[PDB]
Scaffold this active site. Sequence first.
Site, mmCIF file in Angstrom:
data_model
loop_
_atom_site.group_PDB
_atom_site.id
_atom_site.type_symbol
_atom_site.label_atom_id
_atom_site.label_comp_id
_atom_site.label_asym_id
_atom_site.label_seq_id
_atom_site.Cartn_x
_atom_site.Cartn_y
_atom_site.Cartn_z
ATOM 1 C CB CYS A 33 57.937 83.759 57.582
ATOM 2 S SG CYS A 33 58.381 83.095 59.207
ATOM 3 C CG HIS A 49 61.222 84.082 54.800
ATOM 4 N ND1 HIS A 49 61.399 85.189 55.602
ATOM 5 C CD2 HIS A 49 61.084 83.019 55.629
ATOM 6 C CE1 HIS A 49 61.353 84.825 56.867
ATOM 7 N NE2 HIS A 49 61.165 83.497 56.912
ATOM 8 C CG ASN A 70 62.778 83.033 60.223
ATOM 9 O OD1 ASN A 70 62.163 84.080 60.072
ATOM 10 N ND2 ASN A 70 62.278 81.859 59.870
ATOM 11 C CG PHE A 97 61.728 82.300 65.029
ATOM 12 C CD1 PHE A 97 61.488 82.613 63.706
ATOM 13 C CD2 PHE A 97 61.048 81.231 65.592
ATOM 14 C CE1 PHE A 97 60.622 81.849 62.946
ATOM 15 C CE2 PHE A 97 60.169 80.472 64.833
ATOM 16 C CZ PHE A 97 59.960 80.783 63.510
HETATM 17 C C1 LIG Z 1 67.107 72.838 62.203
HETATM 18 C C2 LIG Z 1 68.046 73.088 61.022
HETATM 19 C C3 LIG Z 1 68.540 74.534 61.095
HETATM 20 C C4 LIG Z 1 69.286 72.194 61.136
HETATM 21 O O1 LIG Z 1 68.923 70.797 60.915
HETATM 22 P P1 LIG Z 1 69.454 69.962 59.629
HETATM 23 O O2 LIG Z 1 70.366 70.765 58.755
HETATM 24 O O3 LIG Z 1 68.258 69.314 59.007
HETATM 25 O O4 LIG Z 1 70.327 68.837 60.362
HETATM 26 P P2 LIG Z 1 69.955 67.547 61.248
HETATM 27 O O5 LIG Z 1 69.157 66.602 60.412
HETATM 28 O O6 LIG Z 1 71.226 67.067 61.881
HETATM 29 O O7 LIG Z 1 68.981 68.182 62.366
HETATM 30 C C5 LIG Z 1 69.469 68.574 63.683
HETATM 31 C C6 LIG Z 1 68.420 68.232 64.710
HETATM 32 O O8 LIG Z 1 67.233 69.048 64.510
HETATM 33 C C7 LIG Z 1 66.096 68.216 64.473
HETATM 34 N N1 LIG Z 1 65.037 68.869 63.689
HETATM 35 C C8 LIG Z 1 65.137 69.565 62.500
HETATM 36 N N2 LIG Z 1 63.968 70.018 62.091
HETATM 37 C C9 LIG Z 1 63.057 69.624 63.072
HETATM 38 C C10 LIG Z 1 61.663 69.805 63.240
HETATM 39 N N3 LIG Z 1 60.884 70.459 62.384
HETATM 40 N N4 LIG Z 1 61.086 69.282 64.352
HETATM 41 C C11 LIG Z 1 61.856 68.617 65.221
HETATM 42 N N5 LIG Z 1 63.165 68.384 65.169
HETATM 43 C C12 LIG Z 1 63.714 68.916 64.059
HETATM 44 C C13 LIG Z 1 66.600 66.885 63.921
HETATM 45 O O9 LIG Z 1 65.793 65.779 64.258
HETATM 46 C C14 LIG Z 1 67.938 66.781 64.651
HETATM 47 O O10 LIG Z 1 67.759 66.260 65.971
HETATM 48 P P3 LIG Z 1 68.750 64.992 66.315
HETATM 49 O O11 LIG Z 1 70.173 65.242 65.806
HETATM 50 O O12 LIG Z 1 68.705 64.901 67.866
HETATM 51 O O13 LIG Z 1 68.110 63.797 65.609
HETATM 52 C C15 LIG Z 1 67.304 72.785 59.697
HETATM 53 O O14 LIG Z 1 66.647 71.532 59.939
HETATM 54 C C16 LIG Z 1 66.257 73.729 59.108
HETATM 55 O O15 LIG Z 1 66.562 74.632 58.317
HETATM 56 N N6 LIG Z 1 64.994 73.441 59.394
HETATM 57 C C17 LIG Z 1 63.998 74.469 59.626
HETATM 58 C C18 LIG Z 1 63.363 74.960 58.364
HETATM 59 C C19 LIG Z 1 61.989 75.433 58.802
HETATM 60 O O16 LIG Z 1 61.126 74.641 59.186
HETATM 61 N N7 LIG Z 1 61.758 76.743 58.820
HETATM 62 C C20 LIG Z 1 60.533 77.277 59.383
HETATM 63 C C21 LIG Z 1 60.266 78.669 58.960
HETATM 64 S S1 LIG Z 1 58.700 79.092 59.753
HETATM 65 O O1 LIG Z 2 55.359 80.931 66.142
HETATM 66 C C1 LIG Z 2 55.955 81.777 65.442
HETATM 67 C C2 LIG Z 2 56.935 82.756 66.060
HETATM 68 C C3 LIG Z 2 57.005 84.004 65.210
HETATM 69 C C4 LIG Z 2 57.950 85.086 65.640
HETATM 70 C C5 LIG Z 2 57.624 86.009 66.622
HETATM 71 C C6 LIG Z 2 58.515 87.027 66.950
HETATM 72 C C7 LIG Z 2 59.725 87.142 66.279
HETATM 73 O O2 LIG Z 2 60.617 88.131 66.572
HETATM 74 C C8 LIG Z 2 60.048 86.228 65.275
HETATM 75 O O3 LIG Z 2 61.227 86.287 64.561
HETATM 76 C C9 LIG Z 2 59.159 85.218 64.961
HETATM 77 O O4 LIG Z 2 57.433 83.635 63.872
HETATM 78 C C10 LIG Z 2 56.649 82.713 63.242
HETATM 79 C C11 LIG Z 2 56.688 82.728 61.863
HETATM 80 C C12 LIG Z 2 55.929 81.815 61.154
HETATM 81 O O5 LIG Z 2 55.988 81.840 59.787
HETATM 82 C C13 LIG Z 2 55.136 80.897 61.838
HETATM 83 C C14 LIG Z 2 55.114 80.882 63.220
HETATM 84 O O6 LIG Z 2 54.326 79.974 63.856
HETATM 85 C C15 LIG Z 2 55.885 81.804 63.976
#
Ligand SMILES: CC(C)(COP(=O)(O)OP(=O)(O)OC[C@H]1O[C@@H](n2cnc3c(N)ncnc32)[C@H](O)[C@@H]1OP(=O)(O)O)[C@@H](O)C(=O)NCCC(=O)NCCS
Ligand SMILES: O=C1C[C@@H](c2ccc(O)c(O)c2)Oc2cc(O)cc(O)c21
Lengths: 382, 383
Positions: free
Chosen positions: A157, A296, A329, A208
Amino acid sequence: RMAQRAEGLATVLAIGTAVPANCVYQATYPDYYFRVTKSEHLADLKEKFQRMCDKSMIRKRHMHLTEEILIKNPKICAHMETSLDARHAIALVEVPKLGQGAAEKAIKEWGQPLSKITHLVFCTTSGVDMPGADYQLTKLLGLSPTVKRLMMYQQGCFGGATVLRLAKDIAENNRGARVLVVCSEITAMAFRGPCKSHLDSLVGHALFGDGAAAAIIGADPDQLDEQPVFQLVSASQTILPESEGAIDGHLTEAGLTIHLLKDVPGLISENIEQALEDAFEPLGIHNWNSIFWIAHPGGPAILDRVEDRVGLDKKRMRASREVLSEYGNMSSASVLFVLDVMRKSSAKDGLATTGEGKDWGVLFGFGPGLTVETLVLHSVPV
Amino acid sequence: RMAQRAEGLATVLAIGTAVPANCVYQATYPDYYFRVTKSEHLADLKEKFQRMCDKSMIRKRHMHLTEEILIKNPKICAHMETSLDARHAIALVEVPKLGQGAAEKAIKEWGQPLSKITHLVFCTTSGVDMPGADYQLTKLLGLSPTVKRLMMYQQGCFGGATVLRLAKDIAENNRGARVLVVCSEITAMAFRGPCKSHLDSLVGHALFGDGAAAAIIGADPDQLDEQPVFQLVSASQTILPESEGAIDGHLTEAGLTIHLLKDVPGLISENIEQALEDAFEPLGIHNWNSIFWIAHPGGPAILDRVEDRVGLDKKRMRASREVLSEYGNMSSASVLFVLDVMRKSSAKDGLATTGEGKDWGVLFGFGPGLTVETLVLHSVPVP
Ligand SMILES: CC(C)(COP(=O)(O)OP(=O)(O)OC[C@H]1O[C@@H](n2cnc3c(N)ncnc32)[C@H](O)[C@@H]1OP(=O)(O)O)[C@@H](O)C(=O)NCCC(=O)NCCS
Ligand SMILES: O=C1C[C@@H](c2ccc(O)c(O)c2)Oc2cc(O)cc(O)c21
Ligand SMILES: CC(C)(COP(=O)(O)OP(=O)(O)OC[C@H]1O[C@@H](n2cnc3c(N)ncnc32)[C@H](O)[C@@H]1OP(=O)(O)O)[C@@H](O)C(=O)NCCC(=O)NCCS
Ligand SMILES: O=C1C[C@@H](c2ccc(O)c(O)c2)Oc2cc(O)cc(O)c21
């Protein structure tokens, strides 16, 4: 050397975007996902997925993957079955094809002939091949065979930030250089059935989406022929302390698998002010509400926790949250969607600059490392 | 902007190389390969493989893959069985580790503190992962967390040229910038049993070896602290006409598979003169025997056909053929081995420059496209 190099700052001259036509609404997604993966008997898992989708702040995502493709590829609907070759059969074609969609739109806005493109930077997280998507898109658009290519595979990302850092050095070091950057992502590499052992996989299926974005980048723009949109001022990159394993992505026999920790929003929000200060103190800027924001849109929690820790008015994250809302995303592509939403909404609301009336802007990429990429931008008048 | 940029040309300040300790002699390789892959019943295939190895002009290759690892991973010894995860389990660890071997040696030659490294460019054809080998190497060496990284995955044999083009733009556009470039290749991603349907796979098993190379690149070297080895003058890239499908590489459930065509030596040799003219006409150079040659040692046929078509004295390809002889084809790493062999043999033979007494040099990368990458180099004097 002194004559071989460009004089001014790397500048975005055009931005195009494209998504698969197939649109899946988030409101109904838990039903769709659990049905097509034939997992409706996992009721607790589905309820947990429903809560994730409800908090996602996503209205819709575009997805190349349809039920018809899923019926013809049952191994992709399982959680962890041998499927890389069936996934690659789709993604190795659709990634360059979507990138072509975005690239055509950027090239149409720019208006110069294809012959003027000297460099191509292609960035994906969605499959790998030799020759690369860079070669495939060179062929699809009819770029010069002498186009200088960089193929950025398996980036994640922060890839959108990375291509602008790359384009910056290329455009500024090479007089006349015009860089086409393209980021294209297809979730078919990663799509799988739900499983209670991999709740982070579930989060990925909530966030995603597919998309591609393209920009033309050049230094010393032409007065009559080219129209500056943003300038690229500086690019930094850092690995956050204590963040080992926060975001892993493996390309396996079962396709692309994600390993997300709940700490990600916390780690980024705790480190973002140091990143702001390292980028902006040299420019004597200290007020984070005086700059435009291209964050992002990794998920609502990242944007919420950064907004809260930094002290941002709700307006600052509006363009990031619109991209999250309208597309989810889209990995490396997202930040270019945000840039495009920002310049278009700035003109539509009759503001003074392409950055919501502000002069200075920050662009953040986040991904595996945990890596934070920070670019300082400058707007241009409308 | 005028403040943030460097003044001079991107310069190679140090080169280090590393190979797996495990050394496989080519003279005995047909027997080893057909034995460990349990294919001794394919007599015709083995005779064909014997002729490939005999014409390879390779004396030895370094290979991480040992019999012991092959016995513990039978699926890798089959031709096309599900094996990507076992291959990745080896390569995702060994690629950064071999790159660290080469990087440590380049950093020791350079002699500056690690903190001075501002950028890292990591290139491989051997597996993919997030975070990348770039992250893993940052951790292994203890680079600054603020190091700006480019991760060049699935690059192929022109990757060594590509990292120098990248380092050139970075080092020249960023005052103080010191770029560590690393190329690291582990054939465990590609190693498989022979099959009568895939004779190009057999060519791969005759030529490809393991290795890593690192260089430190910067513009405006420090007069007392840093000693230039080569200057990077220009970098060009072209897709050869009528070359579609000549070199394909797929990352499959069964690992990395190659698809070579017999025309590759022909296609490269037929287009190399135009590439030399495009690079050197602007410098008013026309005599291909007046420049030093860093040709990617892809195989003996490529070097032979280019040498003949261009009209080179046998001396020009000596350093490329030494690398082929001593290491085989190490994909993206090879050209940095050749640069290292050239500067070392030039000093040993008391020649006037790092480029065999010549001022101007050409570096060629070849790979999928079919892609030819052409860099103009400049030597530095040798006391
Ligand atoms: C998932 C999301 C959209 C909504 O969750 P939230 O606003 O935190 O609200 P909640 O705390 O009610 O979470 C909802 C559920 O998702 C789960 N959850 C959130 N993040 C999680 C994670 N990384 N792994 C596992 N479970 C997860 C919570 O445990 C909950 O499950 P439950 O209600 O059965 O206990 C938010 O957590 C989010 O933005 N997280 C992702 C950010 C991120 O890691 N981005 C990655 C970019 S690569
Ligand atoms: O594991 C992933 C999934 C990956 C991805 C693949 C194809 C898509 O169209 C998309 O929106 C996402 O995206 C990631 C991005 C990260 O920053 C970490 C990851 O492990 C992953
Ligand atoms: C492999 C090589 C060392 C063989 O030496 P040679 O001088 O060509 O000798 P031959 O023509 O007798 O080749 C030996 C055998 O390999 C076969 N062969 C050579 N290239 C082949 C290819 N691409 N696919 C299939 N078989 C091939 C020949 O047909 C011959 O089979 P045979 O002995 O049963 O008739 C040489 O062809 C070479 O250097 N190849 C170029 C390198 C290349 O294409 N790839 C670079 C890496 S990207
Ligand atoms: O298919 C391949 C194999 C690859 C390779 C991997 C690992 C190594 O250690 C090595 O020496 C080579 O090399 C290639 C190089 C190319 O230019 C194209 C390919 O398809 C491949």
